[PDB]
Symmetry: C3
Subunit: 215 residues, 3 copies
Amino acid sequence: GNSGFYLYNTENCVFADNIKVGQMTEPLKDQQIILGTKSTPVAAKMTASDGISLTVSNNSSTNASITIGLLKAFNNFPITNKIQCNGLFTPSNIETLLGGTEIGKFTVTPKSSGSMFLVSADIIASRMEGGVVLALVREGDSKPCAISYGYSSGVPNLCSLRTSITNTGLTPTTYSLRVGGLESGVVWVNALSNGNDILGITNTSNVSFLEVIPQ
Amino acid sequence: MGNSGFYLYNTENCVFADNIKVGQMTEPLKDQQIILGTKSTPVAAKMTASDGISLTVSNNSSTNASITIGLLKAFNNFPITNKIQCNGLFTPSNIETLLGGTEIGKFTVTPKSSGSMFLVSADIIASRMEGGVVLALVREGDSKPCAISYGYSSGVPNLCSLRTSITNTGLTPTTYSLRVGGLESGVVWVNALSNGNDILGITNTSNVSFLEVIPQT
Amino acid sequence: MGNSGFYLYNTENCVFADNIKVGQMTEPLKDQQIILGTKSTPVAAKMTASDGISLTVSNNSSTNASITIGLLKAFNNFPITNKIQCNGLFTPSNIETLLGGTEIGKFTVTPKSSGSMFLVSADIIASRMEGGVVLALVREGDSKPCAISYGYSSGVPNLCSLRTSITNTGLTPTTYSLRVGGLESGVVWVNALSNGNDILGITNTSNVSFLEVIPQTN
Ligand code: NA
């Protein structure tokens, strides 16, 4: 179109189709902002990394926007089923896929390169006096990537797994949690020793993944 | 001002004006707008924060205008050091009510981001004669707990825990309370031995914390 | 240099110049300034980070210039996989010293944001014959634990936890160590059965993590 100067209300403005200032070699192009340097301006792109979300809405002649937010880092997986875990964890099945009983499956997608997932499993469990084993398995692996231990005296108790896992890409990954007795015994999740409801209601165990940037 | 044109600043031939209108812009640059290129011609893009980010513009002088990006404050911690005798029980009949156990803490928190969650962690040092411990988070204005967890003591003190995540509705400040009681059974001491004395003869510290996080759906 | 005006770039009637001064600006665009609209005329506004935000200008380049906005690295994880016999106890007499229990780990962390906290969690696999486990976190320099927690083992391995919040006061490296021992009596094994055998025949992993957060000051 045209270019020049014009009065807008009381403001004396320059106008043109586009602009090239300083060290720029072409006019402002897609997603570039005019950025000052020690000398003359450059055309710079704004970009997000490490858990930052950058949303450029570039398709409005009038109502364009750039929003800076946090990438969605948190994934919660409630587990409310009562599950009888008859699968034992033994010295011969611990480094296989066969130990314990799967009590949940969780699919997550990293949003940042070189990130970790902070994983918390907090599982309400009951067994006749003895040990509980919890194991986290990555689908495609041939053995658990994290292993933890809890305890029940007969009455329900919280049994926990805390770990961090290194993320190798930006695609969906499926994890499963398996629970079973240490070397022997039957373990109930979200129930009493006999499979009955704890305090006669539905109870809730939790698994969560918090994506964090590691040092 | 009120002028426009070209002028030499030191050796740099600069354009100058009260304001600028380029590309698809219908008006000159307005509040919080930057000039932003497209595959076509530029637009005026309003710059804004969301989801746990604050965007802050400081304009002290013509030569020191500032735009600060930073994290919104996400972490709320609530120490509990009192020794509380929890003679309130948790029972099949009081569990789905507000009367189970004994209240050991009250927590008011305010979400900074819409549709956020709170990662809640209650880590409570508790003692009782061999048996089970029950913990309940109650949201003020509910008829029953929003989270129930279980612990154990053999008679020596042991950490009892409640982990949950709660969906925030708005930016309204909200109060939660933590209740602790015997699993239908006996008496439970928090931050103390089963007889109510100090563990190791010192004051001990239980914790409740709320971490505001942005959830993926 | 020194040239300016309007030129045709393809079909685009463009203003060109070495630099630009608009609105409330009293000088042309200077280092890391952008042109920002106000409710008035525009200002030159420098972008800066704070509160756990990283902001870097790939600037001394005419080609591939950028401003990247990233989170500062907040997470620090410290796996402990060795079997450790803890023969030091915690007693009323030593609980406020540096002497209670056995040191099972040392961790140097460095806060990225001033006035932040570390959310600290220690999750330790421990066995001992029937009784109490005590966990104590110590800042190098201090004279006694800054945090104390309790666990339990019936004889079979059990997870023993410490969860706490530490207020960071500088941007300088700080060292913490974790100590574990029996409550008043007994031997406690970390990452092992009570006799020191590998649990389930394998190497096990205990974890100590520090997550930097920005606290709501209330
Ligand atoms: Na026991």
